[PDB]
């Protein structure tokens, strides 16, 4: 299985020129694959208190990673693909009203929700040596939905800032709501464990 | 003698774990020596004796 | 001379006015001292699955070749090398083997009481032991303190 | 460069770490993020071919490379099969003491070091101090403000 | 037979006896926030004292380089002391360590650990279990520090654990940047531009390569050290707004002093701390491994998960076979003998001979005080083969 | 790409791992045309089209 | 790079496979040394230099 | 062939029979790379060499 993976990879790169440009930007991935599904394990909330997005996000964070570390286990995946996302539901009407394009919203998130780089105060070379070197720590990325709402799109010529909240409704929600899982007529997330080759 | 000696050595070599590996190199080296020495004793020593 | 801005008058704002430019170290945060004398220490990390003794020997040889072409006033020393403790310990076992053989020969020469007689077993000892080395090469078993 | 540890743990370390979470025969992984640098050593089950192991990790990290911040990508995300253990430390020291330490580092890095990584069995050869020649443009913020 | 059993009960169990490597590796870590200049002054002093010592042939120091983390910390520094040849020196490595420790560790008041050199972190050493406590829950490293200090106290009260230590440190001084987003927007400043200015001045920014000596060497832009020397440095820096007016960095940004960890360590995708332990003389490494486990279980059970690295992982997951192997070896011997002898009864005579040599060895060993190290365990096997020969020949 | 379908801007730090931030229109993408009419793009002349 | 040399702007699909779209100047205008006087680039002031 | 075109001073032509083996050093010649570590310009390197 591994020699085969190496031969295939060598041939993707020999023909790099023949590939389309967009493909080059996101490199082609060569991975040993297994078709066999050793088992399907379904995690189900008995209380029916947890909603499916939450169950999926308990698995990915905790249950899945340890099962992928079990020897002889091929990719272990939950079917839903319901990962947590800060969906920003834009409201076209408001956007037109406040005269703001989606692009402005996208740009604002790029600048506001990011962790940039800050240096270290009191570092060499310095003429007058300071007793301590102090790092600078910054939290640019916004952990909360309300903080996303607070992002300022523009000043508005009256010192009254326009905000994502005025033109949208931010909420935590799954990236893909398309797929669900049923166990004996009960909601569950289905995790499929593929067997590694050999 | 050779069979009896190598008999004890081989299971020890097959012991699992990395300690087993450390005790595999030593167990088999001794085994090799005894088998070779036996052949040498059988053939080389009397001739020269 | 790089011109950041061209003023309204034809004067070019340049890096030289705002800043001072010089060629230095990318990082000033770490130094090395050998015996108080300043020095640049290079750390060698073994490739996984590589014999330490062989690697060290190769490095030392390459260092000697480099030393011949060193600029005047530059010398190299290998202060810390784990291999040294291994070589010595392996050598010590080898010395024990020679001593052991000699002592065995004496005990045999006491029991046999005839010079030649003592030789007959003597010759057998290295043939057997060296044949063992050949076998451990076939197995792929390496020389180690335990084998020795 | 220029980043706090936590930032390096979030933006740089976790994407890489999650990419290689399923690598074959991985016993355990440990990541150490420090102000400026991230080191992640992936350990493998005894007997896993070292070369194959590296090939796996390299294949897995490729997806993570895009998610990395631009600065991290510009610099080298490197997968080397070398343990953090130091087989040996060689020191090159100026006897005439005529040379400046930046110069001495710049001689070893350019010549002495590159012939070392070539030597078989040296997984990694790193000099200490990172003193490579760099143009340094030392900005003075008072002059910047005056000239706007 | 009873004596042999008793000797095995008493003989301490060990892997490999310690032999003076010939080189002592000392890790010197000045106070958490200490700058490089203080660190170097500290090591030069140690180096000067070291050369005075007739015992130490040479010394190599990597300043600003921490060995374990393999990362550059300004406060940390590692000095290797290369001792003389074993014949050339009348002092054992550990005796030399004592002189050095007394000379400066008590006086300089700078953290210093004098350890031996291990070719393999675990294989070379013995018992240095370095278990990780990986938090499952998401809690502040500060809290983790606290929590892992409690477990450390319990480990101290545990009956047989030695020099238990945690590498995690949450004391390093860090300035926390507070970003007034509203103020910044009022000044019409993009956030990326702000930070690019700060990375350029306080930090080092790599623009492009320049060509020197037939090689490409980076061009880094940084402020003069004096400007970034102290806090409030932000007041001097100025960032132009969309409008021509230049806005002081201080207006929208505030720096507040906080304590944090310089080295964030993660084990198996979970924030984790490194608890390093050594087995007390009274217990075998294994017993020690399981002792620390219960200390961790009692004080860190709800959120933290016990994890093991190095030798410790190998030992816990070994589930080693071959316990039966030794009995099997004898059974094999019993059969090959009963075919040579052609009598089922007689091989028993040779097997009975085997305990006698074992008895002699586990006797001298428990007399000298030597533990049941791999050496003894192996040596055993040759004594068992030799006894056999004496027995088979005589019985035949 | 933004209004009609999900657009992935950047990551956020919730629950110890980085998750995606996705931007999409809300319910204004159910009808084929209505959508085309509702969405307005700014021009270079700063006038919505 | 656009006039005297070849500039690969992007890809155009022909016969089922993406070929390249390159931009270069006519060969007469790059035949000689004074080629540079034909080329003109627009300044920030919107004036051709 | 050599004698037909030896006359021409416009084409420098050398006629060689195909090599007996695909990779060879029939000459047995030596290939030495004179590396320059002073960062000299290639024109300067040519003179030195």
Automatic annotation (TrEMBL), chain E:
Coiled coil: none
Transmembrane segments: 321-341, 348-368, 374-396
Location in the cell: Cell inner membrane
Family in the record: Belongs to the resistance-nodulation-cell division (RND) (TC 2.A.6) family.
Protein name, per record: CmeB
């Amino acid at each position: 299985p591994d020699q085969a993976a190496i031969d295939v990879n060598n041939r993707i790169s020999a023909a790099t020129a023949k590939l389309p440009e967009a493909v080059k930007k996101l490199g082609v991935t060569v991975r040993k694959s297994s078709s066999t599904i050793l088992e399907v394990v379904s995690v189900y909330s008995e209380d029916s208190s947890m909603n499916d997005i939450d169950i999926y996000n308990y698995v990915s964070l905790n249950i899945l990673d340890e099962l992928k570390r079990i020897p002889g286990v091929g990719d272990a995946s939950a079917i839903g693909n319901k990962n947590y996302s800060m969906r920003i539901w834009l409201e076209p009407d408001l956007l037109n009203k406040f005269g703001v394009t989606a692009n402005d919203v996208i740009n604002a998130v790029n600048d506001q929700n990011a962790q940039y780089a800050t240096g270290k105060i009191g570092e060499e070379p310095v003429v007058n040596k300071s007793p301590q070197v102090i790092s600078i720590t910054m939290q640019g990325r916004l952990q909360t939905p309300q903080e996303f709402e607070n992002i300022i799109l523009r000043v508005n010529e009256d010192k009254s800032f326009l905000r994502i909240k005025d033109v949208a409704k931010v909420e935590i929600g799954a990236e893909q709501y398309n797929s669900t899982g049923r166990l004996n007529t009960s909601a569950a997330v289905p995790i499929i464990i593929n067997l590694q080759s050999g | 003698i050779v069979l009896v000696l190598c008999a004890v050595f081989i299971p020890v070599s097959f012991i699992s774990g990395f300690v087993g590996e450390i005790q595999r190199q030593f167990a088999l080296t001794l085994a090799i020596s005894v088998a070779i020495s036996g052949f040498v004793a059988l053939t080389l020593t009397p001739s020269l004796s | 001379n790089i011109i950041l801005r061209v003023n309204e008058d034809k004067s070019f704002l340049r890096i030289k006015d705002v800043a001072k430019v010089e060629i230095g170290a990318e990082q000033y945060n770490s130094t090395g001292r050998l015996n108080t004398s300043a020095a640049v220490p290079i750390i060698i990390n073994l490739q996984s699955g590589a014999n330490a003794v062989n690697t060290a020997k190769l490095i030392n040889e390459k260092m000697q070749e480099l030393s011949k072409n060193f600029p005047q006033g530059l010398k190299y020393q290998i202060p810390y090398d784990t291999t040294i403790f291994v070589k010595a310990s392996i050598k010590e076992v080898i010395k024990t083997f020679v001593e052991a053989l000699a002592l065995v020969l004496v005990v045999m020469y006491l029991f046999l009481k005839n010079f030649k007689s003592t030789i007959i077993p003597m010759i057998a000892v290295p043939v057997s032991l060296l044949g063992t080395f050949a076998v451990l090469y076939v197995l792929g078993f390496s020389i180690n303190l335990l084998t020795l | 460069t220029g980043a706090d540890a936590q930032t390096i743990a979030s933006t740089v370390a976790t994407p890489i770490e999650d990419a290689i979470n399923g690598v074959d025969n991985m016993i355990y992984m440990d990541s150490t993020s420090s102000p400026g640098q991230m080191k992640l050593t992936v350990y493998f089950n005894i007997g896993t071919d070292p070369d194959q192991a590296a090939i796996d990790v390299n294949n897995r990290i490729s997806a993570a490379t895009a998610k990395l911040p631009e600065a991290v990508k510009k610099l080298g995300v490197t997968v080397r099969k070398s343990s953090s253990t130091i087989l040996e430390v060689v020191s090159v020291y100026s006897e005439d003491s005529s040379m400046n330490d930046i110069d001495i580092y710049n001689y070893v890095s350019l010549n002495i070091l590159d012939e070392l990584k070539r030597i078989p069995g040296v997984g990694d050869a790193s000099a200490i101090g990172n003193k490579n020649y760099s143009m340094r443009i030392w900005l003075e913020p008072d002059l910047l403000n005056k000239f706007g | 037979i009873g004596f042999i059993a008793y000797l095995f009960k008493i003989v301490p169990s060990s892997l490999v006896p310690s032999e003076d490597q010939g080189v002592i590796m000392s890790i010197i870590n000045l106070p958490s926030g200490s700058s490089i200049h203080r660190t170097i002054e500290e090591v030069d002093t140690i180096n000067k004292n070291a050369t005075q010592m007739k015992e130490i042939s040479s010394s190599v120091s990597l300043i600003g380089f921490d060995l374990f983390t393999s990362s550059l910390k300004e406060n940390a520094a590692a000095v290797f002391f290369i001792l003389k040849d074993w014949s050339q020196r009348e002092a054992s490595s550990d005796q030399i360590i004592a002189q050095l420790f007394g000379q400066y560790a008590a006086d300089r008041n700078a953290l210093s650990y004098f350890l031996n050199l291990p070719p393999i972190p675990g294989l070379s050493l013995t018992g240095g279990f370095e278990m990780y406590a990986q938090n499952k829950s998401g809690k502040d490293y500060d809290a983790i520090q606290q929590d892992v200090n409690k477990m450390l106290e319990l480990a101290r009260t545990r009956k047989e654990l030695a020099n238990v230590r945690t590498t995690l440190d949450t004391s390093f001084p860090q300035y926390k940047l507070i970003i007034d987003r509203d103020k910044m927007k009022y000044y019409n400043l993009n956030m990326q531009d702000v930070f690019n200015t700060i990375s350029a001045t306080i930090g080092t920014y790599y623009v492009n390569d320049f060509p020197m000596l037939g090689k490409n060497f980076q061009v880094n832009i940084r402020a003069l050290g004096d400007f970034r020397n102290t806090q409030d440095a932000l007041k001097n820096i100025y960032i132009r707004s969309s409008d021509n007016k230049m806005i002081p960095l201080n207006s929208f940004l505030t720096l507040v002093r906080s304590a944090g960890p310089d080295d964030v360590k993660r084990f198996n995708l979970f924030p984790a701390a490194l608890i390093q332990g050594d087995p007390a003389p009274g217990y075998t490494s294994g017993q020690a491994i399981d002792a620390i486990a219960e200390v961790a279980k009692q004080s860190l059970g709800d959120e933290y998960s016990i994890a093991w690295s190095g030798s410790a992982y190998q030992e816990v997951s070994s589930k080693g076979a071959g316990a039966y192997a030794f009995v099997l070896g004898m059974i094999f011997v019993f059969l090959i003998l009963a075919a040579q002898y052609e009598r089922w009864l007689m091989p028993l005579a040779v097997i009975t001979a085997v305990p006698f040599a074992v008895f002699g060895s586990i006797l001298l060993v428990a007399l000298r005080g030597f533990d049941n190290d791999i050496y003894f365990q192996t040596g055993l096997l040759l004594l068992i083969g030799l006894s056999a020969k004496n027995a088979i020949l005589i019985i035949e």
